[PDB]
Design a protein around this ligand. Structure first.
Ligand SMILES: O=C(O)CC(CC(=O)O)C(=O)O
Ligand code: F3S
Length: 754
């Protein structure tokens, strides 16, 4: 580039290329002759061939070149095992591993981390020596959650980042396009080959007016999530714009982009502005803010660009929301929630109040919560409810500890957890409740899907802002309304809580703490990564079987699924995170949470040959070792939610050939195409009703599988009648070559020594 500004302090040699962004935006622009939106300037500015790429929103696959790859340890292990199979010597672009998902919340900060490094040494040692070997930066356990460390250090305006985690959109708060992928996508960018993405549609949310009072950043996406619903953002990028953007802090925009994951959006973004500039300078990147000022025309949307849908939100009319309890789109005003809770039968007293995680742990969030706490403390009050605080990184922990906020928070009765996901992925040894107990918890997190936080099917969880969690934690009930109600203080008077007052960013500079990162040695020609042969936590992958040239005849339906089938129903987390690097050991959880439409129950399907109802993994394994190939039938938005490729690998490992649904979630359908399976959808969703558990399916037409040709499916009924239905697919020729080879990895290996 002419300027020589680095990507971050950890890669001082790898410079930001806004000169290329601009050259590819100018090549696209003159092919398209129209204003482009911000996410179009940034996506199309990273095309591998901007002169020739075919560009149509919602239709074409763009072949893109991401700037950096970030990985989290619950998904980094399988991604690094696939990279190890490619045979390639080093990673092609800046990648980092972050160790945040294997640390269980039990007693608090220090004790929980000590136990996690003991319990997990094998996997942390595997991730660091493979990181050292292949040149991947490694953030040590206890250093912080992937998105918080990415916002503090690696996101910048104009970046195209991919991450093996759904909440990777978080990065959009600093003006970049950050997309979550399954681990095999990350190994394409690390292997140095173009990354493909279905060309996004763009939803424009216009922000007008200003935040006031108890209303925070969080409220905007709780409001938008309820307007669009979980199905709302599928296949689109949400792009925030308006005069109101500049009334939100940089870490508030990151809160909003983060939860856009919850409506199925490919990612969300905000346009570069003064708030981002301020945060870039206060986090040791003033030079990035100076470069970006010079390229600002390319980091804002063109005037007059066309959004495929515009939603307008008046921030000055906005008021606090609390969303739940079993989806993030059931939206409520914090004024109404008490009411709805008594008519609906949701438990009114707040058992546990949990604040933090990467969605709501900025210096501003911790401070606004303390500003509430300090008030309750001046009246001899304490949290009525149990109270946990998870700092997003060691820098937010060291900084808020030093400036006092952490001590206010413990003085009202909260325990500070390790800087890791913990209760946000449900990695938590809970004790206050017997399992099955019906109880309400309230979090500042993002997802509140059933069983997400403690695996109690009946814990009702509500997501809101950290200050409202803190206020309701002292209150102990969903009946309390912070902005109206009175609280009875130890000295018998009544008083009411004042709306939080707090610094956006420190007066001082940020404390980073010590010992957080392991640099890779461009040295150690002689790093050795050794999966013990009979290790129960890590296992080297063995190639899947190449496609046999024939059609798929008389396939068994392992399960026909009723309703919502999230990737947590397909591959659960909780106890199974200890097997995220062992494929046959984590496959023993295949589809155990999905509801069987035959009997309305989870984990009991009928074995076609023994005629006994029993566990799905056992049955799929019975089928596999007897030569029966099977299929799953789903309803809508199948594979919704968490990014894990384990949802696609475990079907392949047990004998699965195809998943046919009315519609798929984006990251799960890419993960099925990547593992050699067939993601297919009904040309008519009503055809879901034609297929019963008992039928055998023949998927015919593979010999001339082509983009756009539907595949024909012959349903064969026990009584000899058959029906033929049509099935659509979104494969392009790159992806058909993945199916043909047995998986995308097998194909990457054929472009070397076959
Ligand atoms: O319908 C599809 O072809 C896929 C989805 C999601 C995506 O990959 O962007 C869409 O285009 O809406
Ligand atoms: S990455 Fe963030 S969304 Fe929760 S599971 Fe971890 S704190």
């Amino acid at each position: 580039q002419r300027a020589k500004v680095a990507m971050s302090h950890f890669e001082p040699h790898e410079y930001i290329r806004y000169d290329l962004l601009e050259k590819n935006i100018d090549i696209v622009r003159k092919r398209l002759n129209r204003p482009l939106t911000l996410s179009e300037k940034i996506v199309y500015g990273h095309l591998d061939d901007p002169a020739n790429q075919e560009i149509e929103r919602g239709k074409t696959y763009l072949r893109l070149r991401p700037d950096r790859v970030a990985m989290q340890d619950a998904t980094a292990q399988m991604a690094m095992l696939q990279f190890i199979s490619s045979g390639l010597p080093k990673v092609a672009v800046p990648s980092t591993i972050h160790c945040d998902h294997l640390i269980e919340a039990q007693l608090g900060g220090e004790k929980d981390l000590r136990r996690a490094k003991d319990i997990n040494q094998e996997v942390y040692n595997f991730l660091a020596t493979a990181g050292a070997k292949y040149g991947v930066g490694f953030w040590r356990p206890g250093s912080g959650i992937i998105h918080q460390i990415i916002l503090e250090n690696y996101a910048y305006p104009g970046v195209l980042l991919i991450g093996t985690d759904s909440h990777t959109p978080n990065g959009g708060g600093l003006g970049g396009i950050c997309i979550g992928v399954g681990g095999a996508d990350a190994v394409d960018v690390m292997a140095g080959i173009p990354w493909e993405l279905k060309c996004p549609k763009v939803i424009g949310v216009k922000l007008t007016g200003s935040l006031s009072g108890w209303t925070s950043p969080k409220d905007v996406i709780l409001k938008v999530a309820g307007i669009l619903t979980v199905k709302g953002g599928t296949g689109a990028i949400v792009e925030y714009h308006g005069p109101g953007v500049d009334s939100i802090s940089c870490t508030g925009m990151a809160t909003i982009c983060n939860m856009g994951a919850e409506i199925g959006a490919t990612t969300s973004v905000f346009p570069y502005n003064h708030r981002m500039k301020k945060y870039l300078s206060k986090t040791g990147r003033a030079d990035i803010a100076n470069l970006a000022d010079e390229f600002k025309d390319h980091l804002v949307p063109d005037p007059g660009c066309h959004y495929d849908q515009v939603i307008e939100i008046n921030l000055s009319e906005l008021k606090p929301h609390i969303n739940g309890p079993f989806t993030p789109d059931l939206a409520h005003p914090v004024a109404e929630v008490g009411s709805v809770a008594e008519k609906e039968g949701w438990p009114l007293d707040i058992r546990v109040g949990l604040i933090g995680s990467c969605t709501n742990s900025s210096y501003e969030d911790m401070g606004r919560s303390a500003a509430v706490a300090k008030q309750a403390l001046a009246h001899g009050l304490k949290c009525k409810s149990q109270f946990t605080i998870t700092p997003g990184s060691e820098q937010i922990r060291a900084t808020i500890e030093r400036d006092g906020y952490a001590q206010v928070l413990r003085d009202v009765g909260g325990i500070v957890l390790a800087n890791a996901c913990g209760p946000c992925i449900g990695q938590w040894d809970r004790k206050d409740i017997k399992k099955g107990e019906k109880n309400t918890i309230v979090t500042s997190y993002n997802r509140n899907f059933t069983g997400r936080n403690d695996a109690n099917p009946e814990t009702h969880a509500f997501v809101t802002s950290p200050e409202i969690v803190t206020a309701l934690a002292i209150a102990g009930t969903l009946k309390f309304n912070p902005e109206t109600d009175f609280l009875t203080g130890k000295d018998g008077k009544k008083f009411k809580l004042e709306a939080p007052d707090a610094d956006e960013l420190p007066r001082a500079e940020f404390d980073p703490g010590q010992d957080t990162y392991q640099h890779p040695p461009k040295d150690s020609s002689g790093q050795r990564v050794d999966v013990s042969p009979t290790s129960q936590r890590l296992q080297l992958l063995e190639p899947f079987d190449k496609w046999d040239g024939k059609d798929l005849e008389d396939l068994q339906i392992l399960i026909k699924v009723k309703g919502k089938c999230t990737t947590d129903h397909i591959s659960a987390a909780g106890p199974w995170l200890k097997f995220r690097g062992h494929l046959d050991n984590i496959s023993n959880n295949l589809l155990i949470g999905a509801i069987n439409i035959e009997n309305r129950k989870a984990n009991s399907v009928r074995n076609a040959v023994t005629q006994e109802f029993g566990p799905v993994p056992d049955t799929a394994r019975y089928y596999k070792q007897h030569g029966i190939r099977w299929v799953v039938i789903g309803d809508e938005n199948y594979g919704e939610g968490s990014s894990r490729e384990h949802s696609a690998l475990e079907p392949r490992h047990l004998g699965g050939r195809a998943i046919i649904t009315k519609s798929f979630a984006r990251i799960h359908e890419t993960n099925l195409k990547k593992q050699g399976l067939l993601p297919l959808t009904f040309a008519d969703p009503a055809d879901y009703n034609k297929i019963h558990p008992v039928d055998k399916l023949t998927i015919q037409g593979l010999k001339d599988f082509a983009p756009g040709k539907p595949l024909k499916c012959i349903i064969k009924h026990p009584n000899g009648t058959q029906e033929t239905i049509l099935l659509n697919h979104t494969f392009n020729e790159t992806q058909i070559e993945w199916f043909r080879a047995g998986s995308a990895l097998n194909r990457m290996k054929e472009l070397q020594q076959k």
